[PDB]
Structure formats: structure tokens, C-alpha cells
């Protein structure tokens with residue numbers, strides 16, 4: 485006789501903290517070489533695609549990643565460790581012509597330097613609990629900044645990949661819907 | 669001061685962007701991209717998924733290997749040989765053994781690169797002109813399909829599964845990112 489459960493797998497949709505310094509560094513150290521192998525020597529068509537009107541191009545996403553290496557993660561890590569909660573992070577700020585190959589070189593250099601600084605500043609697991617002040621979010625921990633750093637990379641890789649896939653929305657013909665169905 | 673109704677409706681009607689050279693550029697890069705991204709990461713990264721009953725990173729790589737044996741090229745051959753007279757088979761009548769997660773992922777990458785390399789040679793043997801792209805066969809449910817539509821679906825398959833791998837890895841830190849969670853869902857800002 486046929487039966488079911490109410491909200492059968494409710495309990496499964498809850499998650500603890502999985503951050504590990506070593507494991508985070510494994511990802512962070514790979515993103516630049518991954519983007520270079522993937523995108524280098526592709527036709528410019530691929531570098532200029534987006535997910536539609538008023539969304540960033542692939543090239544612009546890589547520039548954005550470079551900008552965060554300069555102005556975002558490491559500067560806020562330093563600020564946490566130096567200012568603690570006594571001051572909120574400062575606001576940020578305050579040429580598409582450059583070959584994408586020059587961008588890859590820059591991102592790889594900045595990332596390499598940033599991972600050396602990371603290692604200098606966070607020298608034990610106990611340091612992951614040190615707190616600073618976000619202008620909107622309130623008290624934030626080092627582990628949360630670094631996690632967001634790893635997730636930020638991944639989020640923009642996926643952004644890049646979906647932009648490229650969108651180029652062929654019409655081209656795939658009747659495969660379009662099924663191409664949205666995963667795990668089958 | 670006035671506003672428009674459905675201001676950019678007319679911007680949302682996309683044409684066909686497939687070019688053979690550009691398609692092959694991507695397909696030739698996928699194995700080495702997945703290997704440089706995933707090789708030597710902790711097994712934790714390889715076993716992450718997007719939640720209950722979704723595939724692990726490892727399993728997505730195993731599946732891409734299977735697609736290289738079972739899907740794109742065998743269907744291309746069928747289309748070019750049989751045309752629309754006869755639909756190519758659905759996949760639901762030919763089973764495969766579930767494989768061991770115990771095979772080191774390094775071996776899977778080697779296999780995927782080898783099979784992709786072979787498959788791109790075959791593609792160039794079979795599809796030699798623009799006319800060959802306009803050749804039609806018969807999907808057992810969708811009806812008439814063109815070669816360019818199979819090849820385009822192939823490229824998108826790669827990309828869709830790359831995105832699945834990336835999302836599964838990101839998901840691991842859902843709780844870890846703390847108050848950043850909402851904003852990390854907001855793009856182009």
C-alpha cells in the first residue's frame with residue numbers, strides 16, 4: 485500500500501562550518517591558472533559574452549577579480565587584525581583594450597602575493613576567530629572573510645561559465661530545457 | 669517625467685552564435701581546465717555536491733567521461749549515416765555499470781583528456797563543411813535536429829557541468845560565509 489512522508493528530507497538541509505585554511509588556500513591558489521587555461525587564446529567572442537543586457541562580460545568579470553585582489557580581501561583582513569571591532573571597514577574606491585593575457589598575468593601575480601600575505605597574517609587556527617566590524621553586517625570573523633573570498637572566486641567562475649553557455653541558448657535547439665536538468 | 673512599458677522587450681531575441689572553430693576551442697580546453705582546477709585538491713572538494721541526491725564533483729567528472737563514450741560522437745555518426753529516416757536511440761534502454769569512486773581522480777582526468785582528444789579528431793573527420801552542420805537527423809522525442817544543434821548542445825553540456833562542479837564547491841561554505849551569504853548571490857554590482 486502506497487505511502488509518503490511529509491517534508492521527507494527536511495533534516496538534511498542544514499550545514500555546519502566546513503572551512504579549513506589548507507583547503508581554502510588550495511582553491512585560492514588555483515583560480516588564476518584555471519581561468520588562464522580556460523580562457524587564454526579563446527576568440528574574443530567568448531571574452532565579450534555576458535548573461536544578457538546590463539550584465540558584465542567575461543573580460544569584465546576577470547578585471548573585477550583583479551580589482552578585489554588590490555582593494556578587497558587582504559586590505560580587510562589587515563583591517564580586522566589591526567583595528568578589531570573599534571572601526572568599520574572603509575568603503576571601496578573613495579580599459580577593455582588591455583589584452584586578456586595581460587590580465588591573467590596580473591591576477592596570477594596579485595593572487596600569489598596575497599596568499600603570501602594571508603600566510604603572514606593568519607598564523608594559527610585561533611586567529612580565524614578574530615573579529616572586525618563590517619559597516620552593514622556588524623561583527624565579522626576572519627574565517628567569514630576568507631570563506632567569502634573562496635566563494636567569491638567560485639561565484640564569478642560560474643558567472644563566466646554561464647555567460648559562455650548563454651551564447652548557445654538558441655543554437656542548442658530542443659536540448660535547451662533538458663540542459664537545465666542536472667543529476668539525471 | 670514618463671516611464672516605458674516593457675522597455676527592453678526587443679533586446680531579448682537571440683540568434684545563432686555557433687561557429688565550428690569557436691566550438692572546438694572550448695571542447696578542446698575542458699579536460700585540461702578541469703584537471704588544473706581539481707587535481708591535487710583535498711578529497712573533500714571532490715566529494716562535495718549541491719545537497720541530497722545531487723552528484724559529487726567526482727561523479728560529474730565520471731559522467732563527462734561517459735558522455736564521451738556514449739553520447740555526442742555516437743549520435744553524430746548516426747545523424748550523418750541514417751539522417752531523418754530513423755531516430756537515434758534514447759539512452760534509457762542501454763544501461764551502464766555504476767563505477768567506483770575509489771579510482772583516483774587523476775586517472776579520470778587522464779581518461780577524459782584522451783577520449784576528448786580522440787573525439788575531436790573524429791568530429792573533424794565527419795564534419796568537414798558548413799553544409800555538414802545543416803545535416804538533419806531525428807531525436808526520438810524532440811523530432812528533427814541539426815548537426816550544429818548536437819555540437820552546440822555538446823559545448824553547453826561541458827559548461828553546464830563545469831558550473832555544477834563550481835556550485836557544489838561553493839555550497840560547502842554556505843554557513844562559513846556568514847553575513848556575506850545574501851550579497852554573494854547578487855551579481856553585476
Ligand code: NI
Nearest residue numbers: 548636640857
Ligand atoms: Ni564580486
Ligand code: NI
Nearest residue numbers: 731735825829
Ligand atoms: Ni549531463
